[PDB]
């Protein structure tokens, strides 16, 4: 029993972090095979005013790089731009490179952050990609280059390299293709994240987990069809429901159908001094997949 936002074990990824320094700039890189990937702003001469990255790369001093895995220093062979990343070829292969893929995640999908400083893992926590393409992270100045990953069948799927914090505190990264999530710029500008909508499918997962854990005081007997829910959502900061069928497993082991939870969601949207699994507000950080794993192991 119980539900916790968890991370997958980080060991396979820890072996891939390197420290990448250039001038007064220091951040983290991901060392896979003979390549290091890191945010391109490590070569920016200042990160406080606008940057011309092509100019910065044109005047790169290759020997001014210091890339290290622990006390083992990597020689830089070449550097190319890859969207908002540098792809740095180095002289040594990482023998501890796991089997890996890249994937761009979509809003509502969960992944793992390995929070890194000075090229060493410091913390690991789970996150969920918001509808405005930001994440609710904890990162301070040295954290750019911290990877986001998922692990499926021993293969590490890298989906995120940390880049920046918006003026609001929302955190933004790029995919391993170098495409910034949400189209935000890797510039110190005044960009503001879009309105965020709670991911209804995830809220439903949380409420089914709540039921399985014996929490029922909020359960409605009242019911509401998906369609009348969807019209209500778009004026109340929640998304729409299209797979009412990822919940079939949950409806069978609890006896509660989606439409009863959808009616509970509308009342719980702004709890009455009570809590659900410790929460005093609806949370959308848990996916059906996460809940299934924690409740049943598969």
């Amino acid at each position: 029993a119980g539900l916790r936002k968890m991370a997958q074990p980080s060991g396979v990824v820890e072996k891939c972090i390197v420290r990448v320094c250039y001038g007064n700039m220091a951040l983290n890189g991901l060392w896979l095979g003979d390549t290091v990937m890191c945010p391109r702003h490590v070569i920016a001469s200042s990160t406080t005013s606008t940057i011309d990255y092509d100019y910065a790369l044109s005047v790169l001093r290759l020997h001014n790089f210091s890339i290290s895995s622990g006390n083992v220093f990597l020689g830089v062979v070449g550097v190319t731009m890859r969207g908002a990343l540098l792809q740095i070829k180095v002289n040594q292969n990482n023998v501890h490179t796991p089997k890996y893929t890249y994937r761009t995640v979509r809003p509502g999908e969960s992944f793992n952050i390995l929070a890194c400083y000075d090229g060493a893992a410091a913390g690991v926590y789970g996150v969920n990609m918001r509808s405005n393409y930001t994440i609710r992270g904890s990162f301070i100045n040295g954290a750019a280059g911290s990877p986001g990953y998922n692990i499926n069948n021993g293969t590490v799927e890298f989906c995120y390299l940390h880049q920046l914090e918006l003026g609001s505190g929302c955190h933004v990264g790029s995919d391993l293709d170098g495409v910034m999530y949400g189209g935000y710029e890797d510039q110190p500008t005044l960009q503001v994240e879009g309105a965020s909508s709670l991911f209804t499918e995830n809220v439903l997962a949380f409420l089914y987990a709540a039921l399985i854990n014996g929490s029922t005081w909020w359960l409605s007997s009242s019911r509401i069809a998906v369609d009348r829910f969807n019209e209500w959502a778009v004026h109340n900061g929640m998304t729409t429901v299209v797979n009412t069928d990822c919940f079939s497993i949950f409806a069978a082991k609890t006896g509660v159908d989606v439409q009863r939870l959808l009616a509970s969601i509308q009342s719980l949207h702004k709890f009455g001094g009570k809590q659900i699994l410790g929460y005093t507000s609806l949370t959308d950080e848990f996916t059906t997949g996460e809940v299934i794993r924690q409740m049943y192991g598969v």
């Binding site: 951040l27 945010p39 702003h41 920016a44 990160t47 990162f139 301070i140 100045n141 040295g142 954290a143 750019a144 940390h162 880049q163 920046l164 914090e165 918006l166 003026g167 935000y184 710029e185 890797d186 510039q187 110190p188 500008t189 005044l190 960009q191």
Partner: peptide, 5 residues
Amino acid sequence: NSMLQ
């Protein structure tokens, strides 16, 4: 302003 971290 955005902070590049």
